[PDB]
Design a protein around this ligand. Structure first.
Ligand SMILES: [Cl-]
Ligand SMILES: [Cl-]
Ligand SMILES: [Cl-]
Ligand SMILES: [Cl-]
Ligand SMILES: [Cl-]
Ligand SMILES: [Cl-]
Ligand SMILES: [Cl-]
Ligand SMILES: [Cl-]
Ligand SMILES: [Cl-]
Ligand SMILES: [Cl-]
Ligand SMILES: [Cl-]
Ligand SMILES: [Cl-]
Lengths: 115, 116, 116, 115
């Protein structure tokens, strides 16, 4: 598993569960093409998005549907979604974890890249 | 000034100067249309992007060119750019400050929204 | 003003108003001595804590009373307070801004240090 | 394991390895008494700090020695250490994870409290 996503809720101090995540890959014509998607588990994690063979170097966008998450909790959010855009590089280590910490009017995201 | 941006560098503990910022607005055909652009000043702030008149209700995307910033400093970062997407002025005109805190493999962004 | 504090509320997207702040300085006997205190204003800022003369080199602890803030709003948070501990003025006098971003189960703090 | 610590490095995009962590419990006389300590693993984690029996309700301080961490990497840091102070409450869920994200002049910490 070369690409993982982990999402936390800073208001409840818990994993952000059942959050929709969509991954896109940048195509030759500068358009974003759907690549993989899923919903975070009870542990706020999403595994099995893609495979080593499929995850080639290139520019990727990870869209985290935070607006719907906050709505389902009856909390008014600011962002439409959280966006993480990065280049996958074979030179760098091989396992990518995109971590995100959510607040209604703030979020942080971190990339944990390891071997 | 209804739309301001402020950027800090978490590695140096200073404002992030000369950071390029591009703002887009979602058009009727659902594509992103260029709305405004600029660069942060010595204080890490970017003012004068737009005016109350031009800043109508809509979905806006604020793109902060973090890669170019880190590269202009001999650092190779993870993200291409920080992307902040939000609906603006749906409850009437508001003043928005988009704050960002940058690290090479991480960033946070916060919105401060007030009513004049 | 060599030591300022700014606090934002990440739940409301606004400044965190009337947040109590206590500053301590490490004394010769290695105990924390009260140095200065105040509360953030409507802009979430706390100025006038100290003066250039009184703000000597040392190890300072800035305590931000986040629990009292969240409780004063009918919210039950995780942390007692945010604690920011740092050496100040070891390379000559500097101006420090301690920024904090608050959520009920999370906070971030950033130092912006400049030279006048 | 009711109390865990996880630390990430925002400059390198990796777990923060070999970081010293000291936990204190607040005593009747308002003084902080050593409670548990250790060093983060290769995964930036520290488990086995305490046990269910030992971890009673009370006020705790988790000190993360970030200054030394940055020094060992040849990077000039701002803080002496990161401090996390909180009350352990039996009413709330039972497993506490104190997460911290480190930058030289910034840090965030999050509490993930689950069952
Ligand atoms: Cl959108
Ligand atoms: Cl993060
Ligand atoms: Cl991780
Ligand atoms: Cl791109
Ligand atoms: Cl931010
Ligand atoms: Cl602000
Ligand atoms: Cl305390
Ligand atoms: Cl902060
Ligand atoms: Cl600042
Ligand atoms: Cl100390
Ligand atoms: Cl955190
Ligand atoms: Cl976690």
């Amino acid at each position: 598993c070369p690409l993982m996503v982990k999402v936390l809720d800073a208001v409840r101090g818990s994993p952000a569960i059942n959050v929709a995540v969509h991954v896109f890959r940048k195509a030759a014509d500068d358009t974003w093409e759907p690549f993989a998607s899923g919903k975070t588990s009870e542990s706020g994690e999403l595994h099995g998005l893609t495979t080593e063979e499929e995850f080639v170097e290139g520019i990727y966008k990870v869209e985290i549907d935070t607006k719907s998450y906050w709505k389902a909790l009856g909390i008014s959010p600011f962002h439409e979604h959280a966006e993480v855009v990065f280049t996958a590089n074979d030179s760098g280590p091989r396992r990518y974890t995109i971590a995100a910490l959510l607040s209604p009017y703030s979020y942080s995201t971190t990339a944990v890249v390891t071997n």
